[PDB]
Write a protein that binds this ligand. Structure first.
Ligand SMILES: CC(=O)N[C@H]1[C@@H](OP(=O)(O)O)O[C@H](CO)[C@@H](O)[C@@H]1O
Ligand SMILES: N[C@@H](CC(=O)O)c1cccs1
Ligand SMILES: CCc1c(C)nn(C)c1N
Length: 467
């Protein structure tokens, strides 16, 4: 980079009051100077000031969603469920369904060196989360081809962060994309934002590098633009998109009932909830805020509304629609990302951020991280174009939040929930499990179907059913 270019960027950053980022320029080699220039050129210091000022010196009517925006697998006529299943499989057969996997962030509570998706929860098969999810996609394609006689393709768009992108790609490569076609799997990367000190200043990770952090799972939308994923969806004729979080080992990827329901109700956005397990559960709550669909994140709710009770049922929580990060979107919505993505607010968390001030190294929080949330598009959705669908936790939601030996939301509960699901399915089909649980490969059964061959047979738990 030329001296005139470098000087123009230094004036920009200095005039914006961020001139410290050049404080160690005189000590840098050419490579380190080149890095700093390119990194700093990717941010607008003035925009950073505006974000910092909103975050650091910042400036509601809550009810449960109305019954016209809600649904429940429990209250559902089994004929509707069967019809929605069939229409969902028809949409897969028409190559109209895509999956976006949010596999970014860090996964800091589990404390793994690898991307969370790689984690092996200890099933008999030792499949990772990624592989279980990939095989559900493959199975669903197989089921769809049974009705169409033609190839069925659910493209898998896998969003990672800067940190996790390279280990994610190597892993997929080493597993040959889990039997999927690499041309139908796109790994891409969310954006970053610089970390901001408590005094509003950009934090320097090193003498030549700014401390950045991923911009939240709400960064998914803009990243679909700049990565070309949205254009790939358009080329393929995608009309229905399922987005989910990688940490849930029970996730029904591209759930045909969910998608069939959303498409058939012609909603623009849909989302799955489970009954909140208690008042302190670390889950966003889905509700009606100032007349619109909305979510209150567990990190921003007050003890008041989290503890609020149903007027008629004094021991049930008034707000209990727990977000399980399972969203439906009509493709039409993604066509206007340019119009609304920059409207998504920036949520603030105080962080201890390793940085340099004459050498690297922070006891108490020295700055903040900014994040957009994926559910903050819900207030953009008309109530009659929104569906909040209750599902069964024990079939649909088993998150890996914590390291082993926590007690909940950890690898042991994940493994327990998967193998209880398998046993229950096998028992429904007439099999006898002896004994815990049974792992059922997604390639054998996506959601309980195709287990007739186990009828009358005895299975000694633990067991593993594959091809
Ligand atoms: C922005 C976002 O998606 N937050 C989600 C997500 O929380 P995490 O902080 O990422 O663990 O997972 C929860 C389900 O496990 C969900 O209830 C919550 O609202
Ligand atoms: N997703 C969480 C994780 C964190 O505390 O870093 C955030 C909330 C608000 C800003 S970041
Ligand atoms: C979620 C509803 C929607 C669609 C479709 N397009 N736009 C701009 C909105 N808000």
């Amino acid at each position: 980079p030329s001296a005139e270019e470098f000087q123009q960027l230094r004036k920009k950053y200095t005039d914006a009051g961020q001139g410290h980022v050049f404080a160690f320029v005189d000590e840098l080699q050419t490579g380190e100077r080149s890095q700093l220039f390119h990194q700093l050129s990717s941010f607008d210091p003035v925009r950073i000031n505006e974000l910092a000022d909103k975050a650091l010196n910042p400036p509601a009517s809550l009810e449960p969603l109305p019954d016209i925006a809600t649904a429940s697998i429990l209250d559902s006529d089994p004929k509707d469920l069967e019809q929605w299943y069939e229409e969902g499989l028809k949409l897969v057969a028409g190559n109209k369904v895509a999956v976006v996997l949010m596999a970014g962030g860090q996964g800091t509570r589990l404390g793994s060196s690898a991307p969370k998706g790689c984690f092996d929860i200890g099933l008999p098969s030792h499949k990772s989360l990624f592989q279980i999810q990939a095989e559900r996609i493959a199975k669903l394609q197989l089921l769809a081809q049974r009705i169409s006689g033609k190839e069925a393709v659910i493209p898998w768009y896998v969003m990672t962060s800067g940190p996790t992108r390279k280990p994610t790609e190597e892993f997929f490569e080493q597993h040959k994309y889990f039997g999927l076609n690499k041309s139908d799997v796109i790994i891409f990367e969310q954006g970053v934002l610089p970390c901001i000190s408590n005094e509003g200043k950009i934090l320097m990770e090193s003498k030549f590098k700014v401390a950045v952090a991923p911009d939240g799972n709400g960064g998914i939308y803009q990243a679909l633009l700049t990565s070309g994923v949205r254009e790939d969806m358009r080329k393929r004729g995608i009309e229905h998109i399922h987005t989910y979080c990688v940490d849930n080992c029970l996730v029904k990827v591209a759930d045909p009932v969910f998608i069939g329901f959303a498409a058939s109700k012609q909603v623009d956005i849909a989302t799955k909830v489970v009954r909140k397990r208690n008042a302190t559960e670390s889950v966003g709550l889905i509700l009606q805020k100032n007349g619109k669909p909305d979510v209150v994140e567990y990190s921003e709710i007050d003890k008041e509304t989290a503890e609020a009770k149903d007027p008629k049922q004094p021991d049930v929580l008034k707000f209990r629609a727990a977000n399980i990060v399972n969203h439906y979107y009509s493709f039409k919505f993604f066509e206007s990302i340019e119009l609304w993505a920059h409207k998504l607010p920036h949520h603030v968390a105080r962080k201890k951020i390793p940085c340099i001030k004459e050498g690297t190294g922070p006891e108490k929080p020295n700055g903040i991280k900014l994040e957009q949330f994926v559910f903050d598009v819900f207030p953009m959705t008309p109530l009659e174009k929104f569906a909040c669908i209750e599902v069964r936790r024990e079939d649909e939601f088993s998150p890996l939040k914590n390291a082993r030996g926590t007690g909940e939301d950890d690898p042991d509960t994940s493994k327990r929930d998967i193998m209880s699901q398998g046993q229950r399915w096998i028992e429904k089909a007439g099999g006898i499990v002896i004994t815990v649980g049974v792992e059922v490969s997604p390639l054998i059964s996506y959601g309980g179907e195709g287990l007739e061959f186990l009828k009358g047979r005895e299975i000694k738990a633990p067991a593993f059913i594959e091809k």
